[PDB]
Amino acid sequence: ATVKQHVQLALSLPPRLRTFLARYPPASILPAGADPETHKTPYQEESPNPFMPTKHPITGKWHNPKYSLRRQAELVKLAQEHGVEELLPFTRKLNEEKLRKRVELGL
Amino acid sequence: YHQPRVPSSAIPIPNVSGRVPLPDSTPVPEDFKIEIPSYPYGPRRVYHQSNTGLYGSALIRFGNNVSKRNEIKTRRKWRPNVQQKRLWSKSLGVFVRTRVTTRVLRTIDKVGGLDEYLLGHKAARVKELGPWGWMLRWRIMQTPEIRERFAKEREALGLPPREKSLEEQLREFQVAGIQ
Amino acid sequence: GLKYRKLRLTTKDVNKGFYKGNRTGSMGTHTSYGTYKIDYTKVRTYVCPDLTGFKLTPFVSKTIRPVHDQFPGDKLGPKNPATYLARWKSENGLD
Amino acid sequence: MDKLLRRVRMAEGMVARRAQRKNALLKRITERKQNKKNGEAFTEAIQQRK
Amino acid sequence: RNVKQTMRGIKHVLTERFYAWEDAVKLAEQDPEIDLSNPENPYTPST
Amino acid sequence: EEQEKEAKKSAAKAMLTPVQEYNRKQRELRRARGQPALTEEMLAKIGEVVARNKLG
Amino acid sequence: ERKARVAWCGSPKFLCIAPGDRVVVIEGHHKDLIGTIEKLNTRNMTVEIQ
RNA sequence: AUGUAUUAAGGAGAGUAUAACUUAAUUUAUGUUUAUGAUAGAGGUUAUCAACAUAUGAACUCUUAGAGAAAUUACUUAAUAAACGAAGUGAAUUGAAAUAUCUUAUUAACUUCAGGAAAAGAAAUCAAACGAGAUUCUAUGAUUAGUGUGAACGAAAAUAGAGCAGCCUAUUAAAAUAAGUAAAAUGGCUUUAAAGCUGUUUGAAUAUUGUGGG
Ligand SMILES: [K+]
Ligand SMILES: [K+]
Ligand SMILES: [K+]
Ligand SMILES: [Mg+2]
Ligand SMILES: [Mg+2]
Ligand SMILES: [Mg+2]
Ligand SMILES: [Mg+2]
Ligand SMILES: [Mg+2]
Ligand SMILES: [Mg+2]
Ligand SMILES: [Mg+2]
Ligand SMILES: [Mg+2]
Ligand SMILES: [Mg+2]
Ligand SMILES: [Mg+2]
Ligand at shortest distance from the CA of C12: 4
Q: What is the CA radius of gyration of chain G?
A: 11
10 Å CB burial of residue B1 (0-12, 13-18, 19+) is middle
C41 Cβ within 7 A of any nucleic strand H atom:
no
Q: How many helices (H) and strands (E) does chain E have?
A: 1, 0
Nearest Cα neighbor of C86 from A72, B137, A97, E28 is: E28
DSSP string, chain B: ------SS-SSPPPPTTS--PPPSSS---TT---PPPPPTT---SS-GGGGGSB-TT---EEEEEEPSSS--EEEEEE---EEEEEEEETTTTEEEEEEEEHHHHHHHHHHTSHHHHHS--SHHHHHHHHHHHHHHHHHHHHSHHHHHHHHHHHHHTTPPP----HHHHHHHHHHHTT-
Compute φ and ψ for D23, nearest 5 degrees: -60, -40
Which residues, in sequence order, are CB contacts of A44 under 8 Å at separation 6+? A23, A24
- In sequence order, the β-bridge partners of residue C30 are C36
Resolution, Å (one decimal): 3.0
Best of B153, B163, B166 to substitute, by most chain F Cβ atoms within 10 angstroms, is B153
Which residues, in sequence order, are CB contacts of F21 under 8 Å at separation 6+? B154, B159
Which residues, in sequence order, are CB contacts of F54 under 8 Å at separation 6+? A82, A83
Q: H or E element: which one contains G22?
A: strand G22-24
Query: Which E residues in the span 1-47 are in contact with C, Cβ-Cβ below 8 Å?
Result: 2-3, 6-7, 16, 19-21, 23-24, 26-28, 31, 33, 41-43, 45
Compute φ and ψ for D37, nearest 5 degrees: -80, -35
Cα(B15)–Cα(B11) distance, integer angstroms: 11
Give chain A residues 2-31 with Cβ within 7 A of strand H: 16, 19-20
Q: What is the pairing mode between strands A62-63 and A54-55? A: antiparallel
Contact assessment for residue B151 and residue B65, using Cβ atoms and an 8 Å cutoff: no
The set of strand H positions with any atom below 7 Å of a protein CB reads 9-14, 17-22, 24-25, 27-31, 35, 41-42, 44-45, 47-51, 54-59, 69, 71-75, 80, 87-91, 100-102, 112-113, 122-123, 129-134, 166-170, 173-181, 187-189, 198-203, 206-208
DSSP string, C14-47: --SS-----S----EEE-TTS-EEE-TTTS----
Determine how many CB atoms are found less than 10 A away from the CB of residue C62: 7
Q: How large is the angle between the packed helices F40-54 and A2-10, nearest 10 degrees?
A: 90
Contact assessment for residue B152 and residue B73, using Cβ atoms and an 8 Å cutoff: no
> Distances in Å between the alpha carbon of A6 and those of A3, A19, A24, A85, G43?
5, 18, 20, 17, 81
- How far does chain E reach from its first CA to its final CA, in angstroms? 52
By what method was this entry solved? cryo-EM
Give chain C residues 44-83 with Cβ within 7 A of strand H: 62, 65-79
Determine how many CB atoms are found less than 10 A away from the CB of residue B48: 10
